[PDB]
XYZ file of N, CA and C in Angstrom:
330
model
N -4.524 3.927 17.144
C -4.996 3.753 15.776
C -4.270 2.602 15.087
N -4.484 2.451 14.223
C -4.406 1.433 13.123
C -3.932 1.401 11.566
N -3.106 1.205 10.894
C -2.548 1.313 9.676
C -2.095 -0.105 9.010
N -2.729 -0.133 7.959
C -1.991 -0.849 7.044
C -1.809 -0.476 5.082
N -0.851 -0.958 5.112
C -0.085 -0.926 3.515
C 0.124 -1.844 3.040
N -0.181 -2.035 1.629
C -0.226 -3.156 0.545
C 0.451 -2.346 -0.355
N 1.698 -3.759 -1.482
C 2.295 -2.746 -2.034
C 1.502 -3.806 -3.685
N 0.984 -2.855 -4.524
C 0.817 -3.884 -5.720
C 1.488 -4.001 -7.010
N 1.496 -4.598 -7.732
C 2.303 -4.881 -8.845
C 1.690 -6.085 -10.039
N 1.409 -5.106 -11.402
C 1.307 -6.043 -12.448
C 2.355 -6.958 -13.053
N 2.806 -6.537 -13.921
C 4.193 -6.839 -14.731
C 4.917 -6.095 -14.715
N 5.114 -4.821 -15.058
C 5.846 -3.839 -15.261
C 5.428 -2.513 -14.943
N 4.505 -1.837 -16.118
C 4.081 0.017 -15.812
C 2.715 -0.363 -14.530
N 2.274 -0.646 -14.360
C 0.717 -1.629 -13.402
C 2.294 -1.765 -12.106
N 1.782 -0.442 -11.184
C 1.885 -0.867 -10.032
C 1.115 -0.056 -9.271
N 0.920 0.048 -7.727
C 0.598 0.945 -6.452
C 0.663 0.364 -5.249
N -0.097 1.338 -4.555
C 0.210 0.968 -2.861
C -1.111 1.545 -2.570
N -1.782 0.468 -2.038
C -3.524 1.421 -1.351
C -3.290 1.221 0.276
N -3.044 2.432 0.827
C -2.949 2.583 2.796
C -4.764 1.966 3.165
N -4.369 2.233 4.441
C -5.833 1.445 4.882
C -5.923 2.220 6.020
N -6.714 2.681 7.385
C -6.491 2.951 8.452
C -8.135 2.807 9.050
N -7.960 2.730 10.874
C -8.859 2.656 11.657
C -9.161 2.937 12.965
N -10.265 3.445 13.331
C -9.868 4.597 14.699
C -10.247 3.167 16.143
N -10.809 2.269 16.084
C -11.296 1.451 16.600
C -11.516 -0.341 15.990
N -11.799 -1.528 17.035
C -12.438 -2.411 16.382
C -13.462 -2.360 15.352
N -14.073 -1.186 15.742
C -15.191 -1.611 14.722
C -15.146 -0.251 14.544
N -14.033 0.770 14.029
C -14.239 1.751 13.526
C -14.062 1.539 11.608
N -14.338 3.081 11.003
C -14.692 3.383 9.683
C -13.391 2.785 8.895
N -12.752 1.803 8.307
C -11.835 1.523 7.309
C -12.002 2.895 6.594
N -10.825 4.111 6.161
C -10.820 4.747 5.253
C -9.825 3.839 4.261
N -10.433 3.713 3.032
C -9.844 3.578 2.298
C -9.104 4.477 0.875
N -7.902 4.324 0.951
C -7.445 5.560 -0.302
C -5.700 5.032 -0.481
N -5.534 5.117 -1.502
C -4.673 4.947 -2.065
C -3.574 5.653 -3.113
N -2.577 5.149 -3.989
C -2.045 5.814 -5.095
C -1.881 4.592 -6.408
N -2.834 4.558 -7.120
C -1.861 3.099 -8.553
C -1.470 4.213 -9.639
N -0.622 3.571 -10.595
C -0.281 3.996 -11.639
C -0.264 2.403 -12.406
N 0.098 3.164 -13.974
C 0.082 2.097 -14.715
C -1.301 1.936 -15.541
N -2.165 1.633 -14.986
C -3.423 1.574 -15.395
C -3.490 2.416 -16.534
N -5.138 2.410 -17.227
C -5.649 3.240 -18.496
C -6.785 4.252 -18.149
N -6.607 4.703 -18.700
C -7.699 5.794 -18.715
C -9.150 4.850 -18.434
N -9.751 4.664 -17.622
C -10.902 3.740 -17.233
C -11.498 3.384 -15.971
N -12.168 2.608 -15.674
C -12.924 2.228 -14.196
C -11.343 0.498 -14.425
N -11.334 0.951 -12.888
C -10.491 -0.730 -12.495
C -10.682 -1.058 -11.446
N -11.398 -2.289 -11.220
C -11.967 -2.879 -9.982
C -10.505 -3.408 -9.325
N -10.146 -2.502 -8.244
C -9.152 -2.992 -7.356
C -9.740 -2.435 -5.902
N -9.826 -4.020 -5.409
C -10.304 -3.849 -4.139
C -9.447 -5.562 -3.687
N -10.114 -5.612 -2.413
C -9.583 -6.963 -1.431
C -10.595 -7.713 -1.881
N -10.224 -8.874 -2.635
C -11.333 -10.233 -3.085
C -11.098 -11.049 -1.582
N -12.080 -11.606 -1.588
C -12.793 -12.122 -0.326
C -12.959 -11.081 0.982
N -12.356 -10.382 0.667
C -12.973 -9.699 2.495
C -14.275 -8.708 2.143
N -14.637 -8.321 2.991
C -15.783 -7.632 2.490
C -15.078 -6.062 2.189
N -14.536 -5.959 1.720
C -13.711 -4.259 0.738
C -14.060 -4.418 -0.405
N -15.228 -5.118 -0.959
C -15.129 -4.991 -2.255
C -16.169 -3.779 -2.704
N -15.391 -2.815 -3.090
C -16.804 -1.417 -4.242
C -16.647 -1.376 -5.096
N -17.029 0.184 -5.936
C -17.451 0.123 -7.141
C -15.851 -0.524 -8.367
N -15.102 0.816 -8.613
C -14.167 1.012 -9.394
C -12.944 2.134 -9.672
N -12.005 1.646 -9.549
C -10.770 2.775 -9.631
C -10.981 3.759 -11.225
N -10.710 5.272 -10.891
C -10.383 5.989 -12.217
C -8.978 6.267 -12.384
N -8.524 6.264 -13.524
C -7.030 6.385 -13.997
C -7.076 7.859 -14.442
N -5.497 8.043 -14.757
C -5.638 9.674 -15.569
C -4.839 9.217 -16.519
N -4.440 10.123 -17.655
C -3.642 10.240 -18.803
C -3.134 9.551 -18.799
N -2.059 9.246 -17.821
C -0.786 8.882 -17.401
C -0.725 7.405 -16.796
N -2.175 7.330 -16.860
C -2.484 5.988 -15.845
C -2.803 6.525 -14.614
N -2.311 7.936 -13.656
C -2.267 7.482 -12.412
C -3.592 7.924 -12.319
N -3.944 6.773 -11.378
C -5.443 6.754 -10.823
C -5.191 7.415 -9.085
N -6.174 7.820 -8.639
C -6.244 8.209 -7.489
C -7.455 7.514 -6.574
N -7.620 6.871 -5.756
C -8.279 6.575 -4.878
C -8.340 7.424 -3.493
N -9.875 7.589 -2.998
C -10.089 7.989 -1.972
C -12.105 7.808 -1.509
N -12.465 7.145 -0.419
C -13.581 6.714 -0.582
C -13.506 6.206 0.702
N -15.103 5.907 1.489
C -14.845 5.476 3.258
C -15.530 4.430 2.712
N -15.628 3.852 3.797
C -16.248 2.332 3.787
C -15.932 1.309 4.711
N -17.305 1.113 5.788
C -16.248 0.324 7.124
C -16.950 -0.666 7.342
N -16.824 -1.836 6.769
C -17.100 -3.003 6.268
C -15.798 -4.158 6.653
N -14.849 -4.377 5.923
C -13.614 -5.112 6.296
C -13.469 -5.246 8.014
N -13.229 -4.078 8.275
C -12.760 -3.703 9.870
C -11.506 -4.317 10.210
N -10.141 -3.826 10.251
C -9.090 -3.660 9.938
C -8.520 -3.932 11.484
N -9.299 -4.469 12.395
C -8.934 -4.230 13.538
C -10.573 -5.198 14.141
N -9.324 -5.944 15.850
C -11.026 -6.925 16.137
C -10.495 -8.475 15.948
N -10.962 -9.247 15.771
C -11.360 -10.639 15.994
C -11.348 -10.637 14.080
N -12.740 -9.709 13.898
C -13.009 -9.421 11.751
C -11.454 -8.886 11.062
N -10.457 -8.852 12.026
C -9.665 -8.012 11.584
C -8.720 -8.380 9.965
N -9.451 -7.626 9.039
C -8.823 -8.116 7.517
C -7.176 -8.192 7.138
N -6.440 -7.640 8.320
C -5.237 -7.381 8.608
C -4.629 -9.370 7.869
N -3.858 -8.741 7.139
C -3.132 -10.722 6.260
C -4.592 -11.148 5.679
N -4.954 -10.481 4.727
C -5.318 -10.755 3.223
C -4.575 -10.525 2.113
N -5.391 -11.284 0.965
C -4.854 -10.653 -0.111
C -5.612 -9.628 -1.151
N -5.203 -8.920 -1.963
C -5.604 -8.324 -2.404
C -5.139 -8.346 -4.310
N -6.213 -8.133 -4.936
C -6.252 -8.436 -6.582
C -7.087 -7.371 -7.122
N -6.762 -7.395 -8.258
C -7.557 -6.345 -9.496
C -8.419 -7.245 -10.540
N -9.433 -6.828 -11.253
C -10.380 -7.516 -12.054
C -9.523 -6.891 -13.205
N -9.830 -7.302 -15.048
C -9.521 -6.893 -15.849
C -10.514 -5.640 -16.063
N -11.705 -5.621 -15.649
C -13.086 -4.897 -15.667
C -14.014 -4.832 -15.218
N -14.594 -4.180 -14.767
C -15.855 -4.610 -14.102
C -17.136 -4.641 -15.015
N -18.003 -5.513 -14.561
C -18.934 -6.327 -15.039
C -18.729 -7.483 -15.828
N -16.939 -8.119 -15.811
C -16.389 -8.972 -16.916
C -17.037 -10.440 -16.278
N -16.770 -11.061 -15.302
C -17.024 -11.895 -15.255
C -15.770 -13.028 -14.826
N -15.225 -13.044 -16.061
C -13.518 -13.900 -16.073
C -12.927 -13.338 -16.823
N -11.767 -12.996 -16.227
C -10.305 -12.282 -16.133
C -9.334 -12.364 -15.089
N -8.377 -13.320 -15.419
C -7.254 -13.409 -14.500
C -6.926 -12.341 -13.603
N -6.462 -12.182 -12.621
C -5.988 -11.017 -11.955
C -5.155 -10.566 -12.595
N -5.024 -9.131 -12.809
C -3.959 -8.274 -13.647
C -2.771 -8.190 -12.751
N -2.902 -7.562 -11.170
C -2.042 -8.001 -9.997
C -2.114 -8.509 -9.087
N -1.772 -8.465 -8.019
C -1.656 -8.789 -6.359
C -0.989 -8.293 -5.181
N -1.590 -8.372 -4.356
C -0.568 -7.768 -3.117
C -1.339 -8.450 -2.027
N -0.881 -8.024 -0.941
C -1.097 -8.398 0.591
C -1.126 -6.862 1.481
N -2.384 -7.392 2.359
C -3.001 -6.216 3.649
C -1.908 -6.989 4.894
N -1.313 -5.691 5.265
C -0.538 -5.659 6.672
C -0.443 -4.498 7.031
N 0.081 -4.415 8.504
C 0.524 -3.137 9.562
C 1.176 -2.455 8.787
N 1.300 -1.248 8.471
C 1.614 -0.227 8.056
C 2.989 0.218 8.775
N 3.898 -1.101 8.090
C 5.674 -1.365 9.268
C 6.066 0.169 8.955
């Protein structure tokens, strides 16, 4: 199998870590994660340019949002293998332009 971890970070309260994993080359990317920081809202955090991009993250009270959702598109593993990308957040979805709020990087799950 297959693992990778991205660690992310806004400025300060805006951070997380979304895991990645895969049973094959061209097996199912589960994707799921943990952010905090965030607001009570939808937050488009996915991998810009690879094909991981869906709908939108939900936050709680507290900020912490929870991710969990399949989707095997990227393929994390292979020749397609999305393994050393980067990864960013929108300010919103449907915005248009908005700087990235953070960033991180897709690797092996050291």
């Amino acid at each position: 199998a297959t693992k990778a971890v991205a660690v992310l970070k806004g400025d300060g309260p805006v951070q997380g870590i979304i895991n990645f994993e895969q049973k094959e080359s061209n097996g199912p990317v589960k994707v799921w994660g943990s952010i905090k920081g965030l607001t009570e809202g939808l937050h488009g955090f996915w991998v810009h340019g690879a094909g991981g991009d869906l709908g939108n993250v939900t936050a709680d009270k507290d900020g912490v949002a929870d991710v969990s959702i399949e989707d095997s598109v990227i393929s994390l593993s292979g020749d397609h293998s999305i393994i050393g990308r980067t990864l960013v957040v929108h300010e919103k979805a449907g915005a248009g332009a908005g700087s990235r709020l953070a960033s991180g990087v897709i690797g092996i799950a050291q």
